[PDB]
């Protein structure tokens, strides 16, 4: 019935209900490093997450989201290719069933184990609902994850997963600091795109960090034990919740470094 990542309702079927899937600025895309244009007029990114307020973690089928209180300018994103202030509303991951796949964006065709999306909306629009009606409504910060050493800042997330194993389940998740998930460098690529899951609205400025973070094998293993299904229903492991790379069409990927 509803969309999913299975053979019968996966990405290749999304176009039947969501015509925009075959639009002009769809995401994710493949980042060809030898073609990205170094743009010196790009300002440095300004991430202010010191006053962030996490509230809850939930399994909504598809993936698990950590939600923040965005009633005020608490955790914001400015600078880079952005014009205005963007508020953090939530973060989630996309991962695979094996370590060699899981990320949505690819670099020179290279797939990573997973990808973290920190979702923000443009404050000049009032609420997120109005923001998704504008070409510059959202800004998503994407971070790649590779299997290596453990990431301390991620463990608090890994520990609570058991309590939200099935669809619709949530758990209180306060006092989490998203700063613990950032790589050392803030160098990035950027291009105009869209949400990667239905309704696939093209209202996103994508900012993809060049430097990936490392997460241990055991940390990623716990992501893989979640369920797409709700309590009582037959078990379907939540793995490979990622959309394949889409054609770039008439867009240019700019780089803040060289
Ligand atoms: N993977 S990703 O960062 O691109 C992404 C970010 C946000 C959303 C979202 O808010 N969805 C709900 C929703 C419901 C109705 C209209 C718009 C969005 C979905 C995907
Ligand atoms: Hg829009
Ligand atoms: Zn996402």
User: How far is the CA of 165 from the CAs of 56, 67, 230, 237, in angstroms?
Assistant: 14, 17, 9, 10
CA–CA separation, 27 vs 244, rounded Å?
Answer: 9
CA–CA separation, 171 vs 161, rounded Å?
Answer: 9
The rounded Å distance from CA 255 to ligand 2 centre is 24
Phi, then psi, of 153 in degrees rounded to 5: -60, -15
Locate the ligand 1 atom nearest the alpha carbon of residue 140 and give its number: 3
The rounded Å distance from CA 166 to ligand 2 centre is 31
Q: Which residue has the tokens 């893989």?
A: 224
Q: What residues line ligand 1, using a CB cutoff of 6 Å?
A: 117, 119, 132, 140, 195-197, 199, 201
Q: Which of 2, 62, 105, 120 is catalytic?
A: 62
Q: Which residue has the tokens 């797409």?
A: 228
CA–CA separation, 27 vs 134, rounded Å?
Answer: 16
Both tokens of 115, joined, read 């990808």
Q: Which residue has the tokens 């743009």?
A: 39
Q: How wide is the angle at C-alpha 130 spanned by C-alphas 194 and 91, nearest 5°?
A: 55
CA neighbor of 2 nearest in space, from 237, 240, 228, 204: 228
CA–CA separation, 88 vs 168, rounded Å?
Answer: 22
CA–CA separation, 137 vs 218, rounded Å?
Answer: 36
Q: Is 105 flagged in the annotation as binding?
A: no
The helix (H) or strand (E) run that includes residue 253 is none
CA–CA separation, 25 vs 234, rounded Å?
Answer: 37
Method of determination used here: X-ray
Give CA torsion, residues 146, 221, 11, 116, to 10 deg.
Answer: -40
CA neighbor of 93 nearest in space, from 62, 122, 120, 53: 62
Q: Is 34 flagged in the annotation as binding?
A: no
Residue nearest to atom 1 of ligand 1 (CA): 196
Both tokens of 107, joined, read 């670099």
CA–CA separation, 168 vs 235, rounded Å?
Answer: 14
Name the fold adopted by 1-258. Answer: Carbonic Anhydrase II (3.10.200)
CA neighbor of 211 nearest in space, from 80, 121, 116: 116
User: How far is the CA of 161 from the CAs of 35, 148, 222, in angstroms?
Assistant: 40, 21, 7
Name the resolution in angstroms: 2.0
Pocket test for ligand 1, best of 195, 200, 208 (most atoms within 8 A of CB): 195
**DSSP label of 90:** E
The helix (H) or strand (E) run that includes residue 29 is none
**DSSP label of 199:** T
Q: Is 62 noted as a catalytic residue in this protein?
A: yes
- Ligand nearest, relative to CA of residue 129: 1
- Looking at the DSSP bridge assignments, the partners of residue 146 are 214
Residue nearest to atom 4 of ligand 1 (CA): 195
Q: Is 13 flagged in the annotation as binding?
A: no
The rounded Å distance from CA 20 to ligand 1 centre is 14
The rounded Å distance from CA 144 to ligand 3 centre is 12
Q: Which residues of 4-39 are buried (b: 16+ CB within 10 A; e: fewer)?
A: bbeeeeebeebeeebebbeeebbbbbbbeeeebeee
């Amino acid at each position: 019935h509803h969309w999913g990542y299975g053979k019968h309702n996966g990405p290749e079927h999304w176009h039947k209900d969501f015509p925009i899937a075959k639009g002009e600025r769809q995401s994710p895309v493949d980042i060809d490093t030898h073609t990205a244009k170094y743009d010196p007029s790009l300002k440095p990114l300004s991430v202010s997450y010191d006053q962030a307020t996490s509230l809850r973690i939930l399994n909504n089928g598809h993936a698990f989201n950590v939600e923040f209180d965005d009633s005020q300018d608490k955790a914001v994103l400015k600078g880079g290719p952005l014009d205005g202030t963007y508020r953090l509303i939530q973060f989630h991951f996309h991962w695979g069933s094996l370590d060699g796949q899981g990320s949505e964006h690819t670099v020179d065709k290279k797939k990573y184990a997973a990808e973290l999306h920190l979702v923000h909306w443009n404050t000049k629009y009032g609420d997120v609902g109005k923001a998704v009606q504008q070409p510059d409504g959202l800004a998503v910060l994407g971070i790649f994850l590779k299997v290596g050493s453990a990431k301390p800042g991620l463990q608090k997330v890994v520990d609570v997963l058991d309590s939200i194993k099935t669809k619709g389940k949530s758990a209180d998740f306060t006092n989490f600091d998203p700063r613990g998930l950032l790589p050392e460098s803030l160098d990035y690529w950027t291009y105009p795109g869209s949400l990667t899951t239905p309704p696939l609205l093209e209202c996103v400025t994508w900012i993809v960090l060049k430097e990936p973070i490392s997460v241990s094998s055991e940390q990623v293993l716990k992501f893989r034990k979640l369920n797409f299904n709700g309590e009582g229903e037959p078990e379907e492991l939540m793995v490979d919740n990622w959309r394949p790379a889409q054609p770039l069409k008439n867009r240019q990927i700019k780089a803040s470094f060289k």
